[PDB]
Design a protein around this motif. Structure first.
Motif, short mmCIF file in Angstrom:
data_model
loop_
_atom_site.label_atom_id
_atom_site.label_comp_id
_atom_site.label_asym_id
_atom_site.label_seq_id
_atom_site.Cartn_x
_atom_site.Cartn_y
_atom_site.Cartn_z
N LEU A 216 0.83 -1.20 0.00
CA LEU A 216 0.00 0.00 0.00
C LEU A 216 0.86 1.26 0.00
O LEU A 216 0.51 2.26 -0.63
N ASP A 217 2.00 1.22 0.70
CA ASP A 217 2.92 2.35 0.66
C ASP A 217 3.42 2.60 -0.75
O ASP A 217 3.49 3.75 -1.19
N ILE A 218 3.76 1.54 -1.48
CA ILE A 218 4.23 1.70 -2.85
C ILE A 218 3.11 2.20 -3.75
O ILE A 218 3.33 3.06 -4.61
N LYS A 219 1.89 1.69 -3.56
CA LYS A 219 0.78 2.12 -4.40
C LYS A 219 0.53 3.61 -4.25
O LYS A 219 0.19 4.29 -5.23
N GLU A 220 0.69 4.15 -3.04
CA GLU A 220 0.48 5.56 -2.77
C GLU A 220 1.74 6.39 -2.96
O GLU A 220 1.83 7.50 -2.41
N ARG A 221 2.72 5.88 -3.71
CA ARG A 221 3.91 6.62 -4.10
C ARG A 221 4.53 7.37 -2.92
O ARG A 221 4.77 8.58 -2.96
N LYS A 222 4.79 6.63 -1.85
CA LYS A 222 5.44 7.18 -0.67
C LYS A 222 6.94 6.95 -0.76
O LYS A 222 7.40 5.90 -1.21
N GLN A 223 7.71 7.95 -0.31
CA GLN A 223 9.15 7.92 -0.47
C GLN A 223 9.79 6.95 0.53
O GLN A 223 9.15 6.48 1.48
N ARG A 224 11.07 6.66 0.30
CA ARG A 224 11.85 5.77 1.14
C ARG A 224 11.32 4.34 1.14
O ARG A 224 11.58 3.57 2.07
N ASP A 226 12.17 1.91 -0.80
CA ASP A 226 13.23 0.95 -1.07
C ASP A 226 14.20 0.78 0.09
O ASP A 226 15.15 0.00 -0.03
N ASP A 227 13.99 1.48 1.20
CA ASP A 227 14.98 1.48 2.28
C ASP A 227 15.10 0.13 2.98
O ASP A 227 16.13 -0.13 3.60
N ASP A 228 14.08 -0.72 2.91
CA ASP A 228 14.14 -2.04 3.51
C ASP A 228 14.02 -3.11 2.43
O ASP A 228 13.44 -2.88 1.36
N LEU A 229 14.58 -4.29 2.72
CA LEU A 229 14.58 -5.37 1.74
C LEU A 229 13.17 -5.69 1.27
O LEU A 229 12.95 -5.98 0.08
N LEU A 230 12.19 -5.65 2.18
CA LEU A 230 10.82 -5.95 1.80
C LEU A 230 10.32 -4.98 0.74
O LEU A 230 9.73 -5.39 -0.27
N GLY A 231 10.56 -3.68 0.94
CA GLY A 231 10.13 -2.71 -0.05
C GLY A 231 10.91 -2.80 -1.34
O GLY A 231 10.34 -2.74 -2.43
N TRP A 232 12.24 -2.95 -1.24
CA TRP A 232 13.06 -3.05 -2.44
C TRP A 232 12.61 -4.21 -3.32
O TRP A 232 12.49 -4.07 -4.55
N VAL A 233 12.37 -5.37 -2.72
CA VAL A 233 12.02 -6.56 -3.50
C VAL A 233 10.67 -6.37 -4.18
O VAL A 233 10.46 -6.83 -5.31
N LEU A 234 9.73 -5.70 -3.52
CA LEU A 234 8.42 -5.49 -4.12
C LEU A 234 8.51 -4.59 -5.35
O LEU A 234 7.80 -4.81 -6.34
#
Ligand code: HEM
Ligand SMILES: C[C@@](O)(c1ccccc1)[C@H](Cc1ccc(Cl)cc1)n1cncn1
Ligand SMILES: [Cl-]
Ligand SMILES: [Cl-]
Length: 444
Positions: A216-224, A226-234
């Motif tokens: 949901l954070d990625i869908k709403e174009r929120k910054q940072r 990629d800072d964690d492996l979970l976000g980067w991989v998604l």
């Protein structure tokens, strides 16, 4: 027909597994290995974990095994790893899927990311732990090291902060899950495996919930994001849910178990080598006094490169402590080395810790001598604590940074001594039976 290495098969079912797993001081190879190498030589056969096995304390043979991952040998750990770490963990994946996972792992641990994100969190979490120590108090240096490495890994993997509700609940749940892999079957009942299995499922559901939050954070174009492996991989991969879950969980285990014992090993060795702490303190005093000259508080990459003697103690710590004792491998072909046949399908255990204690490659190998590394170097096959070849530890650089930053503030803030007798033991996982109780005293 085959010229097998010499050795015996042990008991028909148990083979020599019991004797092979017998605990031993981590600064040696153990009576089992020491006696078998003395009678049969550095390359012998056995039956271990239900499989005819070739044990190699031969540096040249071990480098050959490591360099030929995928060609002549293949990662092949007991089913406990695949069951606990998951069928998508790098340790059980081979071929392209292992390639992708390893590149994803290295893309996230890139030098650029290791120079910015990871460095600040490492010092941030380092002081978070060191700032809470109080002199003359007797605490477990092993516990504290584990607290540092778990907090850090939890941050890098899932942006989880130390002291939250879900963080402390993850630690409690991870305790049970971790024993399914790192635990002495001679000590821990088989029931622990199934308890570790049900805590794995519990942790996976938690990781999946956090995955949905990050989605949901990625869908709403929120910054940072990629800072964690979970976000980067998604954002930067097309892994499935199952593959992401296994990746996050196995890497948490990977980064946590090795780093904590490494730091605890440094603390143990230095406590007995005051001269190294003395010279370590000078190296970091003249690095900090140069930081105040520029009004600098945070560490940057350059300060790290200035620590040349700590890289020596690091090498010496990994050389003597041996976080990993041996690796699990399987022969993919009939192989010949030094006139010995390794038939296809046989298990092969490269004992990477053997060369580190070989008195024909190191002078007085059982002595903690950090200065040997101005003479010696990490090229060749005398030094292989991270393995080698296509499976060279993808987090070896992060682990060295972890050890460096922690030693930096550690020697600056405290002296310390052993609160009670304690030696590291290999079960084969390295552990201090008494928790490495220490006592600190601030410097002035
Ligand atoms: C003192 C610290 C460490 C030591 C001694 C160490 C040791 C090793 C060794 C010997 C291997 C080879 C295993 C094999 O090929 O069967 C390995 C692989 C690996 N290590 Fe480490 N490790 C350390 C820290 C870390 C950290 C901090 C991480 C992650 C945050 C990590 C992640 C990995 C991964 C992902 C692999 C497998 C990569 C692949 O299969 O291609 N390690 N490590
Ligand atoms: C220490 C380690 O070899 C091990 C521990 C216990 C049993 C067998 C092997 C382990 C292996 C591993 C590597 C990558 C991933 Cl994702 C998960 C695990 N490890 C490597 N580096 C850090 N931990
Ligand atoms: Cl036999
Ligand atoms: Cl056999």
């Amino acid at each position: 027909r085959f010229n097998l290495p010499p050795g015996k098969s042990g008991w028909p079912f148990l083979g020599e597994t019991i004797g092979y797993l017998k605990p031993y001081t981590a600064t040696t190879l153990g009576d089992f290995m020491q006696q078998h190498v003395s009678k049969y030589g550095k390359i012998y056969r056995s039956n271990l974990f239900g499989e005819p096995t070739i044990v190699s304390a031969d540096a040249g043979l071990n480098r050959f095994i490591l360099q030929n991952e995928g060609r002549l040998f293949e990662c092949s750990y007991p089913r406990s790893i695949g069951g606990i770490l998951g069928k998508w963990s790098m340790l059980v994946l081979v071929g392209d899927m292992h390639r992708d996972m390893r590149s994803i792992s290295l893309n996230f641990l890139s030098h650029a990311r290791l120079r910015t994100i990871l460095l600040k969190d490492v010092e941030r979490h380092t002081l978070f732990v060191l700032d809470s120590w109080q002199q003359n108090s007797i605490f477990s240096a092993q516990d504290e090291a584990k607290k540092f490495t778990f907090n850090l890994m939890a941050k890098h993997i899932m942006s989880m902060d130390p002291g939250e509700e879900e963080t402390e609940q993850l630690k409690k749940e991870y305790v049970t899950f971790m024993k399914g892999v790192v635990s002495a079957p001679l000590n821990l009942p088989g029931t622990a495996y199934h308890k570790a299995l049900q805590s794995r499922a519990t942790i996976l559901k938690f990781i999946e919930r956090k995955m949905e939050e990050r989605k949901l954070d990625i869908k709403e174009r929120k910054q940072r994001t990629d800072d964690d492996l979970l976000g980067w991989v998604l954002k930067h991969s097309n892994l499935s849910t199952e593959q992401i879950l296994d990746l996050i969980l196995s890497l948490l285990f990977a980064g946590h178990e090795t780093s904590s014992v490494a730091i605890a090993l440094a603390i143990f060795f230095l406590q007995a080598c005051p001269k190294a702490v003395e010279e370590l303190r000078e190296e970091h005093l003249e690095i900090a006094r140069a930081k105040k000259e520029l009004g600098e508080s945070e560490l940057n990459w350059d300060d790290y490169k200035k620590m040349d003697f700590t890289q020596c103690v690091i090498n010496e710590t990994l050389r003597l402590g041996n976080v990993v004792r041996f690796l699990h491998r399987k022969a993919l072909k009939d192989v010949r080395y030094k006139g010995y046949d390794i038939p296809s399908g046989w298990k092969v255990l490269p004992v990477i810790s053997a060369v580190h204690l070989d008195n024909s490659r190191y002078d007085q190998p059982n002595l903690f001598n950090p200065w040997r590394w101005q003479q010696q170097n990490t090229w060749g096959n005398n030094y292989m604590p991270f393995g080698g070849g296509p499976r060279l530890c993808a987090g070896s650089e992060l682990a060295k940074l972890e050890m460096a930053v922690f030693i930096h503030h550690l020697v600056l803030k405290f002296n310390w001594e052993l609160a009670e007798d304690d030696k590291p033991f290999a079960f084969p996982f390295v552990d201090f039976p008494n928790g490495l109780l220490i006592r600190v005293s601030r410097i002035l």
